[model samples]
Target: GSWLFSTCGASGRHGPTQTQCDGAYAGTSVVVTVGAAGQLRGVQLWRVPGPGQYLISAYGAAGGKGAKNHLSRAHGVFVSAIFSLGLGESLYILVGQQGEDACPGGSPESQLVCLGESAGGGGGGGGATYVFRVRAGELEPLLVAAGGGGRAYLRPPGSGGRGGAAGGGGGWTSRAPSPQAGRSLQEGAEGGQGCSEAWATLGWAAAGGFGGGGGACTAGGGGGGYRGGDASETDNLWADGEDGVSFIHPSSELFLQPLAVTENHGEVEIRRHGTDEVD
Candidate 1:
C-alpha cells in the first residue's frame, strides 16, 4: 500500500487540480490540500488502481477575516464516507480555497476608503470541498464539505459571519440592513448588496458560482456547498454572513465532524480499505 499528498501554495488567486495527483500507486491513500494561491484552478482526478472499499474525507476552507473589527473568521466543516469502487474507476476531487480578507491593511476606515463605497468592508466567503464519481461520463457527487461565510464589516456594534453547517444542511440567515438567507441545494450563495454600488462592480467582492464563495460589501459573502450559504444585508446590527452546507452519499457509511482541519484551506483524504481481502 502507498500514500499520496497534495497541497496548495500560500498566496494566489485559485487552487489545485489533477496535475498534482500524478504518479499515484495502487492501493494508495491520497491526501489533497491548498498548496499555493492560484496554483491549479481545475478539478483533480484519481483513478482507482484496485477494487475495494475506500474511505473518503473532505474538509472545507475557512472564511476570510473582516477588515473593520478584524474579528475571527469562522471555520469550515468536515464530511467523510466509505464506498466500494472497481478497478479503473475514476474519482474527481475539488479542494476549496480560503476566502479573501476584506482589506489587507489594519486600518478599518482606510480599508473602507480603499473600497470606495458607502457600505462597510466585508470579507470573501470560503470555498467548498467536493468528491465526485464519474458514472457514464457524468459526474455524480459522492461527498461534499461546506466552506464558511466571510466576516461582515459594519459600523459600530456589528457581528461576524457564521461558520458552515454540519451534515449537508442549508446556510444560516442574517437580518439588519436587509433580510436574506442562505441558498438552497446545488446553487451558489448570495453576495452583499448594501448601497447603490454593487460589490461585483468593485471587482473584488463578487458573488460565488457553483462551488466558490461570494465576495462582500458591508455584508459578508456566502459560503460554497451542496447548498450554498447566504450573504448579509446592509445597515443592520448583526451583519454577519451565513454558513455553508455539507453532504454525504446516502448509500455510503456516513461520518461527520466539525472543524476537522485547523488550517485556512480545504483538504481531501482517501484511504483504500480491505485491500488484502478478495473483492
Candidate 2:
C-alpha cells in the first residue's frame, strides 16, 4: 500500500482527481483549493503503504473589495513546511476562503434594516488556511497561513479605505495613520470603533472567533490566524484593518513568505519526496 490522499471540498477543474498518490516513485504535486464560501473543507492524507516525507505549502485567501477599488484590498500569505509521517499516520489540510465583498447598502444594519440603501458597506475578513496532524482522534495544528483583512467602505469624497495586511509569522505593523498590529499566538487583535455611534456595533471588526473578523460600517474586518489582526476605525475617509499571524511546526523545515497579492480563494499543494528526488 501507498499514501492515500482524500479531499472534502475539491471541485471544478481543480478536483482531487488530478492527484497521483500511488506510484513506484514520487509523483507530481497536487493542488487543493477552497470549496464553498464560508465553509471549512478538509483534505485527509492517510499513510497506508509506509512512512515518508512530504512538502506542504499553503496560501491564504485575499480580502474583499471596497466599492469598485480592488487595489485597496489586502492579499493572503504563503507558508511551506516539510513533515515526516509514519505508518497509519494521517494529516489534515484545510484551505481558506476569500472575504466577501462589501454590500452596496453600507453596514450590516443598513443592509438588514434599510431596504433602500444609500452608502457603501465594509468588506468581510478573509479565512485562514491550516494543516493538522491527527493523533488518537485529536487534531493538532502543524502549520497555518494567516488570511488578509477586508477594506473599509469609504464615503463619497474619499476613494476607498485601505485593506488590512496579511498575517506574518511574527507580527505586522499598520501602514495607516493610526498604528496597530496582531496581538499574540492565543488571542486575536482588536478592531477599531466606527466613525459615529449610529454606525458602530458590538461585532464590528471585532477579533476573530473561529474564523475571520466580522465586517462593519466604519471599518473592515480583521484577518484570521493564530493571532488575528486588528480592525480599523477613523473619522477620516481612509480606515484600515489589522493583519493576521502565521505559524509553523517546530519539528518541520520552514519555508514561509508573504504573497504580494492574492485574490479570490486560497490553495494548498502537497508533494512527496523520494530518495532520488531533487530539491
Candidate 3:
C-alpha cells in the first residue's frame, strides 16, 4: 500500500495540459504511504515516479547579477541520503528558493537589502530542500537541507569589490555540513567540505557537498548541500554567474546510489511506491 502526489507544476496548478511531476514550491507538503516491507514504491521525478532503498537528492537555487551588463550562470550543490520507510508511515517534503540581492537603485549600497536562506550578490541566492519523517501528527526531519549563498555586487575599484555571500549548509541527524563565504578572483571561492558519517554504512554522504567563494567577477551562484559550484566568470562588461546542480538516485542495495535529476526553477520532490524512495 502507498500514497503518491501527482504534484502541480511550477505554477502550483494541476493539469493533463501540464507536466505531472515537476515544479514544487515551499511550504507545500507531500504525504506518501509506505508498504509492509518497510519500503516505498512507484515514485516520480524528471519525467515522474520509485522503490528500493530510496535515495533522496536536492539543490538550492542559483545566483545572477546586473540589469544591463550583468551576468549569472552555474548551479548549486545536489545532494542526497539513503533510507527505507516503515509500513503506514509518511514523509513530508519541502522545496527551497533562490536568494534575492540588491541592485544599484533605491537605497545606498551600504544600506542595500537582500533576502534568502542562501544569499546572492547583485543576484539572488538559492534556497534549501529537505524531507522529514511523519509520525503521529508530528514532524521529525531526516535531513535539514540548507541552500548555498549568492555573491554580492562588486564595489568600485580602489577599494576591493564587495564579495557576495555564500549559502548556508545542509545536514542529517545532528551533523550539519560547513557553510561557505565569498572571496575574490585572486583568492578564488572555496568549496564546502562533504559529509560522511550517516552514509558510512553505505560508504559516503552525497549531499555533504562544499560551498563556493565570492569574487571580483560577476556574482557567484550559491553552493548546494552537495558539491558546490564556482563563481561567475567575466565576459567583457557583461557576465553572469553560474548555477548550482541537483541530483537524484535509486538503488536496491543498501549502498550509495547514482543521481537522477529533473530541474526547473528551484523546487522539491518526494516519490514513493511498492518500496521506498526519496527526491
Candidate 4:
C-alpha cells in the first residue's frame, strides 16, 4: 500500500477509476485510491523525475470478485519473477484475466471485450514524451514499459515529438489527455501507448490494451493500439487500467547520490510474467 506510480497517472486528476476487475495475480499488488494517497495500484511505472528512494510496482486488473489472486486473475500467465529495482524499490507485473477464456463469450462475438473490467491493462502503442535530465554528463533511461491488449481497430495520428509514437485506444473508447508526459494508461492507452512505446508490444498491458482499450480506431480511445481505463474516484471515475511512466532530472551528482530512472513508453514484447489475471 504505497504510492506515486507513473508513466503518467495522476496529473489533471480525473482518470483511474474504471473498475470491476475481479481477477489478477502475477507479481502481487493493490491500493490505487489516488486522491487521498496510496497510488501504487498497478505496476507499469510511469513517472521518474528524480528525488531519490523510489521503487514501486503496482499492477492492475484482478477484481473478478468472489475472490481471486489479483494481477487481474491470471490467464495470460507470466507468473512474475524478474526483479532488479532500486531507489525506493518496486517490481510488480499485475495484469491478466479478461474472462470468457480471456476474451470469449460465445463465438468470436467478443468485440475485443472487457467491460466486465481489467484484463491486462498496459500495452498497445502510442509514443513520445521522453524528457530527460539525469545530468552529470549523460544518463537517462527511465523504464516503466507496459500496456497492450484491448484491440478492435482504428489508428493514425501521433507524434507528440521526441520519441514519436502516439495514437492508440479503441474498443469502449474514452480519452482526452495524452500529449505524453505523465498520466499513464497503456495496454492500448490514449495516444500514449505505455507512455510512448515501451518497446511496442501491441497488446501488452497498462499502456495499451485489455482495458486500456485499443484495437484500432481513431487511434485514441480503445482501438488496437491500446490505452484505456483510468476514470478514477476509485473505480468510479471509470477508465480502468493504467501503468507506464518515464521521467528523469538528475545531475547534481545524481541529485546528491540519490537516483532512480525509468523511460519506457515504447519498445516491448516480453509477455509471460504477469500471471494471467487481467479482468
- Which is the leading candidate under TM-score? 1
Runs of candidate 2 exceeding 4 Å displacement: 1-50, 103-120, 136-138, 155-213, 233-237, 274-278
TM-score of the candidate numbered 1? 0.67
lDDT, model 3: 0.31
User: Least accurate stretch of 10 residues (summed lDDT) in model 1?
Assistant: 164-173
Measured against the true structure, the TM-scores of the candidates, in listed sequence, are: 0.67, 0.59, 0.39, 0.26
Native-to-model Cα distance after best TM-score fit, residue 138 in candidate 1, in Å: 2.5
- Candidate 1 lDDT tens digits, 108-170: 443454455424355556767767775885546788788777676653501223332111112
Q: Write the per-residue lDDT of candidate 2 for residues 1-279, one digit (tens) a residue.
A: 222233223311121222222321135333233322212222334332357877777776565555433455678777877777677665555455566555433446555432333423455555556666657765566877776776665534101123332211112222222212222222221222222332344122222212333343345556656555556534223454554667787887875455635465566666776434555
Model 4 Cα lDDT, one tens digit per residue, 1-279: 233223232211122322321122123343222221132233232232223433223222211100111233211111112222235332222222121112222122222333443222222222212111233544232322223222211111221111212222221123334432122222222233332232232232133322232211111112211122221211111132222222222221111121111122222122222213332
| Best-first order by lDDT | 1, 2, 3, 4
- For candidate 4, give the lDDT: 0.24
Off by over 4 Å in 3: 1-55, 64-70, 101-121, 134-146, 155-264, 272-279
The best candidate in terms of lDDT = 1
Better of 1 and 3 by lDDT: 1
